Amino acid sequence: MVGQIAKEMGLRAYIVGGVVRDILLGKEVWDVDFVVEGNAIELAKELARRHGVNVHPFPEFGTAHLKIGKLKLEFATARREPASLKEDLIRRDFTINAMAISVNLEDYGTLIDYFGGLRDLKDKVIRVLHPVSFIEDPVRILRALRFAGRLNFKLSRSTEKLLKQAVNLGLLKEAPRGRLINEIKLALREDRFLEILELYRKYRVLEEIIEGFQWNEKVLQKLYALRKVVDWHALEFSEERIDYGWLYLLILISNLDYERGKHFLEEMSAPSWVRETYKFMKFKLGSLKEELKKAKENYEVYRLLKPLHTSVLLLLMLEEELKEKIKLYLEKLRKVKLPKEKIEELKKELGERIEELKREIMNK
């Protein structure tokens, strides 16, 4: 599609960055990013045209978003911020993000590796292009680790020292907060997110990020324990799933104050029930686990756990004692139902009698 228009336009168009990586590693992505030696916006406009699909150009920035099918496309004009592709690439973060694939019909299919992105790709390694890089875009500090987390990669040695420097230089602080919180967000959407936390703690990045936070053993314990819990509840109920990353985020801010914590979650654009989970854990959780343990009958447990959110329950499973309790609630007590004739006999106040029959049959 693009290669042919680039012929008609006599341009050169390339697939660039993570997408390429995702391809070499065989991930599927319908979000595809290009860099153009030529006018990108018009290439986009003609692609859209011939497909007859709506396209949004961005004249100021010089890019265009357009969506072919459920597949998404963003065309960007090459820039050094003319510019050779190698210039567009050399400004990027990591070797494995620095590659490109030709849609140009002559070299079509070609992986373009200047900095050894493929070499470094097989070697399972996070390597920046140049050493100033961290200073250039400090958010990368996380992304690096993030990559290393998701794909199980090691930092380049030089990269390692570079990163510890940058961290230590508190660049992590002086970077605009918005991009950082953005990153942390995208980090906690990860399946490998725990390993990312391993790297976080390793470089102590979080201490340069959130106000008043530091790491303690118990936190880590309950974090791993959380991974077990999430593994399990994800296994049993496939329809009951939530985005679990938040939990771990929460587990970090637990020892923190409620003021700075809720400020931080609102800062994290945490969903309502998330910040609500923060509030309920900060305030009434002690009484919660107490009266949960103070409940002798299965139905009392039922009446205690009903109004509350699921994530909160998942958080309540961390205590060894309450494990079998939550197991009973989730697998049994909440599964019990009722016939007709009896209801009609209670009808001859109703919900009273129903709650009563609940209390009666549930205890065993």
| Beta strand extents in the chain (DSSP E only) | 12-16, 31-37, 55-58, 63-68, 71-77, 100-102, 111-112, 125-126, 154-155
Nearest residue (CB) to ligand CTP, 18 versus 245:
18
Q: State which of positions 16-55 bind ligand CTP (CB under 6 A).
A: 17-18
What crossing angle do the helices spanning 193-203 and 157-168 adopt, rounded to 10°? 70
Query: Which CB sits closer to ligand CTP, 151 or 206?
Result: 151
Closest CA relative to residue 31, chosen from 76, 65, 6, 79? 65
Number of residues that bind ligand CTP (CB under 6 A): 9
33 marked ligand binding residue: yes
Q: How many CB atoms lie within 10 A of CB 97?
A: 22
Residue 28 or 239: which CB sits closer to ligand CTP? 28
With contact defined as beta carbons under 8 Å apart, do 115 and 129 qualify? yes
- Report the alpha-carbon distance of residue 59 to residue 41 in Å, rounded: 8
Is 137 within any annotated ligand binding site?
A: yes
Q: Is 9 helix (H, G, I), strand (E, B) or coil?
A: coil
Q: Shortest Cβ distance from residue 226 to ligand CTP (Å)? A: 24
Closer CB to ligand CTP, 92 or 275, in the complex: 92
145 is in an annotated binding site: yes
Among residue numbers 88 through 147, which ones bind ligand CTP (CB under 6 A)? 92-93, 97, 137, 139-140, 143
Looking at beta carbons only, is 76 or 326 nearer to ligand CTP? 76
Helix axes 272-282, 285-293, angle to 10 degrees: 70
199 annotated among ligand-binding-site residues: no
**Is 141 labelled as part of a ligand binding site?**
yes
What's the DSSP call for residue 128?
B
Residue set of the binding site for Mg(2+): 31, 33
Residue set of the binding site for ATP: 18-21, 92-93, 97, 137-146, 150, 179
Q: Which residues bind ligand CTP (CB under 6 A)?
A: 17-18, 92-93, 97, 137, 139-140, 143
